[PDB]
Homo-oligomer: A and B are copies of this chain.
Amino acid sequence: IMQKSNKINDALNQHYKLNVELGLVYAHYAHVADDEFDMPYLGKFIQHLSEDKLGVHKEYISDYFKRNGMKLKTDVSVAVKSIPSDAKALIQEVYARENEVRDHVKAIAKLALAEDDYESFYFIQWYVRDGLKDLTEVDDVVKLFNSSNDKLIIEETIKEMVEKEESEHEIWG
Protein backbone atom coordinates (compact mmCIF):
# COMPACT_ATOMS: atom_id res chain seq x y z
CA ILE A 1 0.00 0.00 0.00
CA MET A 2 1.01 3.67 -0.50
CA GLN A 3 3.38 2.67 -3.30
CA LYS A 4 4.99 5.72 -4.91
CA SER A 5 3.80 6.88 -8.33
CA ASN A 6 6.45 6.21 -10.96
CA LYS A 7 5.09 9.02 -13.18
CA ILE A 8 5.36 11.61 -10.38
CA ASN A 9 8.83 10.25 -9.55
CA ASP A 10 9.82 10.93 -13.18
CA ALA A 11 8.28 14.39 -13.39
CA LEU A 12 9.96 15.37 -10.11
CA ASN A 13 13.36 14.06 -11.22
CA GLN A 14 12.87 16.13 -14.37
CA HIS A 15 12.04 19.14 -12.19
CA TYR A 16 15.14 18.46 -10.05
CA LYS A 17 17.17 18.46 -13.28
CA LEU A 18 15.58 21.69 -14.53
CA ASN A 19 16.34 23.48 -11.26
CA VAL A 20 19.98 22.39 -11.30
CA GLU A 21 20.46 23.40 -14.92
CA LEU A 22 18.56 26.68 -14.54
CA GLY A 23 20.63 27.51 -11.46
CA LEU A 24 23.84 26.96 -13.41
CA VAL A 25 22.62 29.15 -16.29
CA TYR A 26 21.63 31.87 -13.84
CA ALA A 27 25.08 31.70 -12.25
CA HIS A 28 26.54 32.38 -15.69
CA TYR A 29 24.01 35.14 -16.45
CA ALA A 30 24.90 36.73 -13.10
CA HIS A 31 28.59 36.78 -14.03
CA VAL A 32 27.78 38.34 -17.43
CA ALA A 33 25.43 40.97 -15.97
CA ASP A 34 28.30 42.32 -13.89
CA ASP A 35 31.25 41.56 -16.12
CA GLU A 36 29.88 42.44 -19.56
CA PHE A 37 26.90 44.73 -18.92
CA ASP A 38 28.36 46.68 -15.94
CA MET A 39 25.29 45.91 -13.80
CA PRO A 40 26.59 44.33 -10.55
CA TYR A 41 23.25 44.67 -8.76
CA LEU A 42 21.43 42.95 -11.61
CA GLY A 43 24.20 40.37 -11.19
CA LYS A 44 23.45 40.00 -7.49
CA PHE A 45 19.72 39.67 -8.20
CA ILE A 46 20.32 36.90 -10.73
CA GLN A 47 22.92 35.22 -8.49
CA HIS A 48 20.33 35.04 -5.68
CA LEU A 49 17.94 33.33 -8.09
CA SER A 50 20.77 30.95 -9.00
CA GLU A 51 21.16 29.98 -5.35
CA ASP A 52 17.40 29.50 -4.91
CA LYS A 53 17.24 27.01 -7.79
CA LEU A 54 20.35 25.10 -6.71
CA GLY A 55 19.24 25.42 -3.08
CA VAL A 56 15.77 24.86 -1.64
CA HIS A 57 14.20 24.20 -5.06
CA LYS A 58 16.20 21.00 -5.56
CA GLU A 59 16.62 20.25 -1.87
CA TYR A 60 12.96 19.88 -1.13
CA ILE A 61 12.60 17.32 -3.93
CA SER A 62 15.48 15.24 -2.60
CA ASP A 63 13.98 15.46 0.90
CA TYR A 64 10.54 14.45 -0.41
CA PHE A 65 11.98 11.38 -2.16
CA LYS A 66 13.55 10.11 1.09
CA ARG A 67 10.16 10.19 2.76
CA ASN A 68 8.15 8.20 0.26
CA GLY A 69 10.36 5.68 -1.56
CA MET A 70 10.91 7.69 -4.73
CA LYS A 71 14.33 7.36 -6.37
CA LEU A 72 16.60 10.36 -7.00
CA LYS A 73 18.33 10.63 -10.38
CA THR A 74 21.25 12.99 -11.02
CA ASP A 75 21.72 13.57 -14.77
CA VAL A 76 22.82 17.10 -15.65
CA SER A 77 23.92 18.62 -18.94
CA VAL A 78 23.94 22.33 -19.66
CA ALA A 79 26.24 24.61 -21.64
CA VAL A 80 25.89 28.36 -21.98
CA LYS A 81 26.78 28.73 -25.65
CA SER A 82 25.39 32.20 -26.34
CA ILE A 83 24.24 35.07 -24.16
CA PRO A 84 21.56 37.69 -24.78
CA SER A 85 23.01 40.86 -26.31
CA ASP A 86 22.25 43.30 -23.47
CA ALA A 87 20.93 43.52 -19.92
CA LYS A 88 17.29 44.06 -20.91
CA ALA A 89 17.37 40.91 -23.04
CA LEU A 90 19.23 39.09 -20.26
CA ILE A 91 16.44 39.67 -17.73
CA GLN A 92 13.81 39.03 -20.40
CA GLU A 93 15.35 35.59 -20.96
CA VAL A 94 15.28 34.93 -17.20
CA TYR A 95 11.61 35.96 -17.35
CA ALA A 96 10.94 33.50 -20.19
CA ARG A 97 12.58 30.65 -18.28
CA GLU A 98 10.59 31.38 -15.10
CA ASN A 99 7.35 31.41 -17.10
CA GLU A 100 8.27 27.94 -18.34
CA VAL A 101 8.72 26.86 -14.71
CA ARG A 102 5.09 27.79 -14.01
CA ASP A 103 4.01 25.55 -16.90
CA HIS A 104 6.17 22.60 -15.79
CA VAL A 105 4.80 22.92 -12.25
CA LYS A 106 1.20 23.08 -13.52
CA ALA A 107 1.74 19.74 -15.28
CA ILE A 108 3.01 18.16 -12.07
CA ALA A 109 0.02 19.34 -10.03
CA LYS A 110 -2.40 18.12 -12.71
CA LEU A 111 -0.58 14.78 -12.74
CA ALA A 112 -0.73 14.40 -8.94
CA LEU A 113 -4.53 14.75 -9.01
CA ALA A 114 -4.74 12.31 -11.94
CA GLU A 115 -2.69 9.81 -9.88
CA ASP A 116 -4.72 10.48 -6.71
CA ASP A 117 -1.33 11.30 -5.14
CA TYR A 118 -2.43 13.78 -2.50
CA GLU A 119 0.94 13.92 -0.72
CA SER A 120 2.45 14.94 -4.08
CA PHE A 121 -0.33 17.46 -4.73
CA TYR A 122 0.35 18.90 -1.28
CA PHE A 123 4.11 18.90 -1.84
CA ILE A 124 3.89 20.69 -5.20
CA GLN A 125 1.80 23.57 -3.80
CA TRP A 126 5.06 25.14 -2.63
CA TYR A 127 6.25 25.14 -6.24
CA VAL A 128 2.88 26.43 -7.48
CA ARG A 129 3.14 29.41 -5.14
CA ASP A 130 6.84 29.93 -5.74
CA GLY A 131 6.35 29.75 -9.51
CA LEU A 132 4.27 32.93 -9.48
CA LYS A 133 6.28 34.60 -6.70
CA ASP A 134 9.51 34.09 -8.66
CA LEU A 135 7.94 35.37 -11.88
CA THR A 136 6.67 38.49 -10.09
CA GLU A 137 10.15 39.25 -8.74
CA VAL A 138 11.71 38.91 -12.18
CA ASP A 139 8.86 40.98 -13.66
CA ASP A 140 9.66 43.80 -11.22
CA VAL A 141 13.18 43.96 -12.73
CA VAL A 142 11.98 43.70 -16.35
CA LYS A 143 9.75 46.74 -15.74
CA LEU A 144 12.78 48.84 -14.78
CA PHE A 145 14.36 48.51 -18.22
CA ASN A 146 11.13 49.94 -19.68
CA SER A 147 10.94 52.85 -17.21
CA SER A 148 14.44 54.30 -17.64
CA ASN A 149 17.20 54.46 -20.24
CA ASP A 150 19.85 55.01 -17.56
CA LYS A 151 21.62 51.86 -16.39
CA LEU A 152 22.71 53.44 -13.10
CA ILE A 153 19.16 54.56 -12.31
CA ILE A 154 18.01 50.99 -13.02
CA GLU A 155 20.88 49.67 -10.87
CA GLU A 156 19.87 51.79 -7.90
CA THR A 157 16.37 50.36 -7.88
CA ILE A 158 17.68 46.80 -8.23
CA LYS A 159 20.03 47.49 -5.32
CA GLU A 160 17.12 48.29 -3.02
CA MET A 161 15.34 45.17 -4.29
CA VAL A 162 18.21 42.85 -3.42
CA GLU A 163 19.06 44.59 -0.12
CA LYS A 164 15.45 44.89 1.14
CA GLU A 165 14.56 42.83 4.19
CA GLU A 166 12.39 40.06 2.73
CA SER A 167 8.82 40.20 4.05
CA GLU A 168 6.62 37.41 2.72
CA HIS A 169 3.28 38.15 1.08
CA GLU A 170 0.49 36.47 3.05
CA ILE A 171 -0.42 34.24 0.09
CA TRP A 172 2.52 34.21 -2.31
CA GLY A 173 5.41 34.69 0.11
Contacts of A72 in B (CB 8 A): 28, 31-32, 35
User: Range of interface residues on chain A?
Assistant: 35 or more
In the assembly, what is the distance between CA of A144 and CA of B66, in Å? 16
Contacts of A157 in B (CB 8 A): 152, 155-156
Contacts of A20 in B (CB 8 A): 24
In the assembly, what is the distance between CA of A132 and CA of B11, in Å? 20
Residue A62 at the chain B interface, CB threshold 8 Å? yes
Residue A68 at the chain B interface, CB threshold 8 Å? yes
Q: Is A151's CB under 8 angstroms from B155's CB?
A: no
Closest chain-B Cβ to A143's Cβ sits at a distance in Å of 4
Q: Determine how many copies of this chain the complex contains.
A: 6
In the assembly, what is the distance between CA of A82 and CA of B132, in Å? 28
Known contacts A24-B20, A126-B170, A151-B147; A105/B118 CB under 8 A: yes
Q: Is A77's CB under 8 angstroms from B80's CB?
A: no
Contacts of A113 in B (CB 8 A): 113
Q: Is A118's CB under 8 angstroms from B110's CB?
A: yes
Choose from B58, B78, B129 the contact partner of A76 (Cβ within 8 Å).
Answer: B78
The 5 closest A-B pairs by CB, nearest first: A147-B151, A74-B80, A148-B152, A109-B118, A38-B143
